[PDB]
Amino acid sequence: MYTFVVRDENSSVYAEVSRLLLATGQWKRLRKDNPRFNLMLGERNRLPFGRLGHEPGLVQLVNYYRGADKLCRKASLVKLIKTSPELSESCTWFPESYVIYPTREVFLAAYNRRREGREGNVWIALISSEASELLDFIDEQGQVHVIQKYLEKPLLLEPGHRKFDIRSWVLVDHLYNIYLYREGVLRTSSEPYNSANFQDKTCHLTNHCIQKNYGRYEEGNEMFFEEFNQYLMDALNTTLENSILLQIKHIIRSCLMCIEPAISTKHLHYQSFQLFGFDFMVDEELKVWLIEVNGAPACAQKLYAELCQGIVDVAISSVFPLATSIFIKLHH
Amino acid sequence: MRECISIHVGQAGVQIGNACWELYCLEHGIQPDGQMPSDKTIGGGDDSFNTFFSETGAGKHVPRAVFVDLEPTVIDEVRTGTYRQLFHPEQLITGKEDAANNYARGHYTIGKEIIDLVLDRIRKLADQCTGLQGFLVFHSFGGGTGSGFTSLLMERLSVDYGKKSKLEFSIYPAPQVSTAVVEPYNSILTTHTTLEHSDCAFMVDNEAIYDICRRNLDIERPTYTNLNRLISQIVSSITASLRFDGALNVDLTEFQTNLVPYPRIHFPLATYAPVISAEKAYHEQLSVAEITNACFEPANQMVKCDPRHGKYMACCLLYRGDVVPKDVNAAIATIKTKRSIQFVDWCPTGFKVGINYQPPTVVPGGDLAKVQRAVCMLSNTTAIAEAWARLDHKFDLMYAKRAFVHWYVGEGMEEGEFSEAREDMAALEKDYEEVGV
């Protein structure tokens, strides 16, 4: 039998991956602190990578890439793009961002050209058009935060005149194969998009939680690719693959290839995989923008069974084999 | 010229000492009887190799070394082995009953009765030195003698040789070859007591050496002899600057200056390449760039850890064989573009490089192939703290139940030394975290 431990009871994804493993009859679950495991479904904070790969006679695998946080924290992501030549200061798919420490050096330099050319000049932290009022908010909080150009002309679904974000799930296995789950999900706003006041932000913040009119156009404010594609054909005379998905695969490949030297476990004494959540924003011109990367994402109830089963097939059973593919392999 | 005295404590320290001195003799052309034909100054001299060898009027070159173990069987093999003529009987010190894998028995019960004898034998070597620099101390973390007696000896050496540098070669415990279940206790106890008395310590994890022997030497079940010959090669690379003409790491003080900017964080990581099997009939000789690049693969380190996720405070490259600076710099420029090499902000980002043209020596009939060029990298990286985290975790599991603690208390030790030692380790791990984030 293969052995595994569960150290993040709050993970809906890996809770489902536990059951699948048990249901194979070839996987036994140990107690949190038993060291003689094949697989660690690790905690999200202070995972003890230093204690992995030192158990004689056990091939050990873990569901997190040490060093992947540099991509999955808003402040670190901005630093990674501005300083990595692979992505560069003038990367075309990441919005202008600046890291602001709250007790701004160059942010005001760009914001003051904003007043020059009279261009769109709304930014986000939490949304505003006046810098000195978002900074009163940043410092009356406590922690660091990024301020980023708010995209004023997003692509709006019809009917509804609604805003949305695209969540892509990406699995990276121990060989650093990059697998894009074929099923995405649009996280829509049930409210019409109002550009006259950002203080009212239920039509701007597209989070499924922040939508507490919610459930009107589609179940749970979730529009999946089948329907969204048919829409792009009827409405705009194009496909999801051509207008959006090419850029998304390009962005995913770019991000993950940039940090591969820093996080790869190819020649390590333990092995890693990780499931990422990429969040994309599409603009008026069918142009995709990366918003953030989630290192511990959740799924949609529709897709849990399929995706979690895919994690077992691609990420776990590839290392521990037992006694049609739902992924698109992004090549590199 | 300034002398260095090597001290080997316990089984691991003695058997590793055997391997090192065998190799030293082969590297300097010293025969098992102590004769050295190439030495034209009979009876003395201040050559570089005289740092490790004294000379008799009869032309015998005698290691500046003392061997000490609380039980005699291991040192008895030195007394009757190939190099028995090399050592004067007074440098081979043995008791009759060992520390029974018990730090407290080695440090208190048994150590109190032999420490004065050992210091007198060390004094005998020190008196033959015109300008002694310090000591190189070889021992295991896990043995009762290697841990317990070493810490007592290190304390007394600070008292009797206050101005002398002390370097360690320490064998970190690995279950695949380990002998005792209480080795995590002995490691933390000895590291706590010794920390302030050691200027620089090179840890060797038996797990790393074991896997290197299996992977690269194709030895299915490596023995101590396999491990120690490989360890002696790394030890030799580290001490070559003390035994040969050169400008880098020429005195023990220079090791601390070059490798240790803070006193407590004095555990440099050793990485060695290339390790090639003698049995392999076809081999392609690795270039400077290939062996240098291998210095950043965790599989070639003396302790398995991930330097990409720590910060560097110092980095030395020690080459032996056909190497010229131009190729080193070319290899480094390439490596810097493809690897995660982060230094602390208060340290310059640079490599100190030393090259000895004499290629590595191998013991005839050994497992290591002769190579055209080799390198040992000494980097002081916070990533080595992973090994402390591992050791402290095992310590915590047993100590939470007080398992085996009665054996130490029964030797005169107090329970509070366990928690005192563990707190020092907690502070040490905290130091590495402050410097590495």
Add this chain to the structure above:
Amino acid sequence: REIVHIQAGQCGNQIGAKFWEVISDEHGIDPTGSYHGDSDLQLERINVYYNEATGNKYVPRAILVDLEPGTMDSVRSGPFGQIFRPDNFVFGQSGAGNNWAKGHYTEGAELVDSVLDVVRKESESCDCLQGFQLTHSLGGGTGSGMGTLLISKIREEYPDRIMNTFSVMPSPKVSDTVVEPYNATLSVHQLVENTDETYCIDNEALYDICFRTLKLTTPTYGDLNHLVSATMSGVTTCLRFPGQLNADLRKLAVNMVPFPRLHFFMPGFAPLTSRGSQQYRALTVPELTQQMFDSKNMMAACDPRHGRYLTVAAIFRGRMSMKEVDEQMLNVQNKNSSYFVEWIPNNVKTAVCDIPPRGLKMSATFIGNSTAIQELFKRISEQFTAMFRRKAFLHWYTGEGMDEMEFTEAESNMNDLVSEYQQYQDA
């Protein structure tokens, strides 16, 4: 590192004699004490158990004790009886009557000083005495009562030496008298305080093994002692032969005993063999490993799955792949990790010896410190209380000067030992 061996009483002298037969053959020593062997590994650590005599003769460092001459006469008549130093035969004439009080307080007290005289003479010749090993039963009177009296006096004169015992636990399946639970309970109380290591050899297990596994329908003591001598040869291998470990009794105690009172080991052996019958297929390393951990191969009638292992020492003997041994031993722990306490990391150690025991090409001996050993002491505690609640058969003991209180005290301490084992089975 000399060991002084002591065998007391009928059972102690019968298993003790067989032990010396078995290891004498393994070291190439004949009944006359002359060495006619082929390998020098036989002599490298021969001094642990043998003194050297005039003419290059090897004399077991063994002392034979009993309150009646009968069994000791059988030993001196036995095949190797002429190898023991005649002065090391120390016997009375009255016997102990299966009465712990007689061995410990009256009959035994008259003889104990002359046993200590022989012990002292043997110890004074020792370069560096490791300690002592005692073979005895707990259900009788001499080995039980006088044996534990010797242990107490030995500790008083050698407080810094290791005391190790091979202690045969009584069983109603192999029983001589109804008072065996009394004698065993009184002895266990002594063992808990005055030994560092005790191999619990359960006559219940020995009987079941002869009956259920070796298919002997009516086993004798000779059949039981065949299992005992094979186990005793196994667990002393690392003391008698030069290995990677260079093991001794103190290192064994340090690493096997996390808490001083919990020093009672379950021995195990594989492959299980009956006398005068040789099976011809050698066991593969996987089969050796699986059998050695099988409850049916344990010499204490306890279910290891009813507790957890605190520590384990395993010894493989013969020509085999040490890489395969490492893999199989790692396989057992990894596949059954719940039965090894997690608060003692890496608590299973393995040794290998090239010399196999007589009649086998490969063998495995198991030494377990398992909390399931509490089942053995509970068993005896129930049989003890069944009689003691009615004070039955007590007059045999009060007639020697004992008081009921001393029985109550021994009962309480053994029940404490049981609950202390239970404390770490739940941790």
Add this chain to the structure above:
Amino acid sequence: MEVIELNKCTSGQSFEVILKPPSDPSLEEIQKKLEAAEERRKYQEAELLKHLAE
């Protein structure tokens, strides 16, 4: 790459390469703790011999 302090001899050479600049207890105390531990051993042994005398 800044190459500095290059030193050459017949046995080899050494040099430094920079890529980027920056951003005890006394004998008396030992003797007492060893004696304190020995005191504790002898106390424990005296307790045992007392117990064995009872």
